[PDB]
Design a protein around this motif. Sequence first.
Motif, PDB file in Angstrom:
ATOM      1  N   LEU A  91       0.865  -1.216   0.000  1.00 50.81           N
ATOM      2  CA  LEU A  91       0.000   0.000   0.000  1.00 50.81           C
ATOM      3  C   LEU A  91       0.877   1.233   0.000  1.00 50.81           C
ATOM      4  N   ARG A 130       1.374   5.095   1.126  1.00 47.86           N
ATOM      5  CA  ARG A 130       0.928   6.011   2.207  1.00 47.86           C
ATOM      6  C   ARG A 130       0.664   7.404   1.620  1.00 47.86           C
ATOM      7  N   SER A 131      -0.407   8.055   2.074  1.00 42.93           N
ATOM      8  CA  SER A 131      -0.683   9.500   1.827  1.00 42.93           C
ATOM      9  C   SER A 131       0.594  10.324   2.045  1.00 42.93           C
ATOM     10  N   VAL A 188       0.161  12.950   5.712  1.00 43.56           N
ATOM     11  CA  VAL A 188       0.085  12.483   7.127  1.00 43.56           C
ATOM     12  C   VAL A 188       1.449  12.715   7.787  1.00 43.56           C
ATOM     13  N   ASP A 228       3.746   0.769   2.627  1.00 42.03           N
ATOM     14  CA  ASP A 228       3.389   0.050   3.871  1.00 42.03           C
ATOM     15  C   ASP A 228       2.731  -1.304   3.546  1.00 42.03           C
ATOM     16  N   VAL A 229       2.455  -2.095   4.587  1.00 41.35           N
ATOM     17  CA  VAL A 229       1.615  -3.326   4.503  1.00 41.35           C
ATOM     18  C   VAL A 229       0.359  -3.051   5.322  1.00 41.35           C
ATOM     19  N   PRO A 230      -0.727  -3.848   5.179  1.00 39.93           N
ATOM     20  CA  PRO A 230      -1.895  -3.679   6.042  1.00 39.93           C
ATOM     21  C   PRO A 230      -1.569  -3.781   7.544  1.00 39.93           C
ATOM     22  N   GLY A 231      -1.949  -2.785   8.329  1.00 36.08           N
ATOM     23  CA  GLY A 231      -1.913  -2.976   9.799  1.00 36.08           C
ATOM     24  C   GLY A 231      -2.487  -1.809  10.562  1.00 36.08           C
ATOM     25  N   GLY A 232      -2.270  -1.770  11.871  1.00 34.65           N
ATOM     26  CA  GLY A 232      -2.722  -0.651  12.714  1.00 34.65           C
ATOM     27  C   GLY A 232      -2.316  -0.854  14.156  1.00 34.65           C
ATOM     28  N   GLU A 236      -8.181  -5.068  10.330  1.00 33.09           N
ATOM     29  CA  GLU A 236      -7.412  -3.984   9.656  1.00 33.09           C
ATOM     30  C   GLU A 236      -7.361  -4.292   8.144  1.00 33.09           C
ATOM     31  N   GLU A 259      -9.110  -1.612   5.354  1.00 35.74           N
ATOM     32  CA  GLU A 259      -8.273  -0.820   4.423  1.00 35.74           C
ATOM     33  C   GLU A 259      -8.265  -1.480   3.043  1.00 35.74           C
ATOM     34  N   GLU A 272      -7.352   4.908   3.564  1.00 38.42           N
ATOM     35  CA  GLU A 272      -6.421   6.004   3.958  1.00 38.42           C
ATOM     36  C   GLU A 272      -5.213   6.035   3.017  1.00 38.42           C
ATOM     37  N   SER A 273      -4.804   4.869   2.504  1.00 37.37           N
ATOM     38  CA  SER A 273      -3.723   4.754   1.493  1.00 37.37           C
ATOM     39  C   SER A 273      -4.202   5.339   0.155  1.00 37.37           C
TER      40      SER A 273
HETATM   41  C1  LIG Z   1      -4.862   1.530  11.284  1.00 36.29           C
HETATM   42  C2  LIG Z   1      -5.366   1.309   9.905  1.00 36.29           C
HETATM   43  N1  LIG Z   1      -4.531   0.394   9.144  1.00 36.29           N
HETATM   44  C3  LIG Z   1      -5.005  -0.386   8.164  1.00 36.29           C
HETATM   45  O1  LIG Z   1      -6.123  -0.834   8.075  1.00 36.29           O
HETATM   46  O2  LIG Z   1      -4.060  -0.500   7.155  1.00 36.29           O
HETATM   47  C4  LIG Z   1      -3.552   0.743   6.748  1.00 36.29           C
HETATM   48  C5  LIG Z   1      -2.388   0.906   6.011  1.00 36.29           C
HETATM   49  C6  LIG Z   1      -1.956   2.188   5.687  1.00 36.29           C
HETATM   50  C7  LIG Z   1      -2.688   3.303   6.091  1.00 36.29           C
HETATM   51  C8  LIG Z   1      -2.269   4.684   5.810  1.00 36.29           C
HETATM   52  C9  LIG Z   1      -2.436   5.744   6.645  1.00 36.29           C
HETATM   53  S1  LIG Z   1      -2.001   7.184   5.892  1.00 36.29           S
HETATM   54  N2  LIG Z   1      -1.524   6.382   4.489  1.00 36.29           N
HETATM   55  N3  LIG Z   1      -1.704   5.059   4.635  1.00 36.29           N
HETATM   56  C10 LIG Z   1      -3.833   3.120   6.843  1.00 36.29           C
HETATM   57  C11 LIG Z   1      -4.268   1.855   7.154  1.00 36.29           C
END
Ligand SMILES: CCNC(=O)Oc1ccc(-c2csnn2)cc1
Length: 291
Positions: free
Chosen positions: A136, A138-139, A142, A150-154, A177, A181, A235-236
């Motif tokens: 993924l 990232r914006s 932020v 990134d990879v999926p997570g939180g 998560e 996403e 958010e990505s």
């Molecule tokens: C906590 C949420 N996490 C999830 O579900 O995976 C993601 C992976 C990346 C982003 C992100 C934030 S800003 N650009 N990317 C947000 C979420």
Amino acid sequence: DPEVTLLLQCPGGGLPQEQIQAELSPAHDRRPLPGGDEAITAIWETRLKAQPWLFDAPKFRLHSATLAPIGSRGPQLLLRLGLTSYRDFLGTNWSSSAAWLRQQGATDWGDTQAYLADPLGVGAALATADDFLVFLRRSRQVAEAPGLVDVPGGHPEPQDLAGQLVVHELFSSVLQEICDEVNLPLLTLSQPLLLGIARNETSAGRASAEFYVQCSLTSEQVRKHYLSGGPEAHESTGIFFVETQNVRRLPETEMWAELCPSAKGAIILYNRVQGSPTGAALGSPALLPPL
Ligand SMILES: CCNC(=O)Oc1ccc(-c2csnn2)cc1
């Protein structure tokens, strides 16, 4: 890779939920700061007076993780957890003085993390049915690792006898998560395996649990699900896929410089725990090319 350190590598190709114990105790909490927790309240007040829509949230704190002797019966891992918050994170790990706090923790407690919030993250090496891992973008707007891969997570929010409910919420949260996403249906996902725990040395050593999850959809089908939600469903700002064949040598590519530290952690542990065959068959030259 100075920005990531391995705290734990799991045995057996990764541990399932039923093999992990947690101990959630106020003995596992952050120590009060030497000059008092007033410095944290000061940073929080300043931040709210600029962004009054911000809200605190509780987080799990990682104190330590002890692996059983390899090959043993019974539980294989003990996680010692406390409780922290987003507010405590902004006033310690994210503070400009975070390195001073690590030095003082070494001096006072023999523990570089003793004065740090150290909220526990989760992350996933998510494989498709056609043998790709999911990535993924990232914006660029932020505060943390803007514009990086990134990879999926939180960072999961709270709600072995409260222990087993905490391990359940950790495994549950990595699936939730991915659904939130990537916009995948929950029923397309395997139960997670814990690969290990990695530390982000750019965020004063805060740790993420890194999991392996298999999806029954192909890369083309995952892409459709992600995009079909529209710009507000994620958010990505993009999704892409690397063949598991090519993940083995990812640290030698130009992609490696673009990966955020917690995603480097997930790929290092995927390579060590799910890759790297031990047997004659998967070890043979034709299936494991040298160099
Ligand atoms: C906590 C949420 N996490 C999830 O579900 O995976 C993601 C992976 C990346 C982003 C992100 C934030 S800003 N650009 N990317 C947000 C979420």
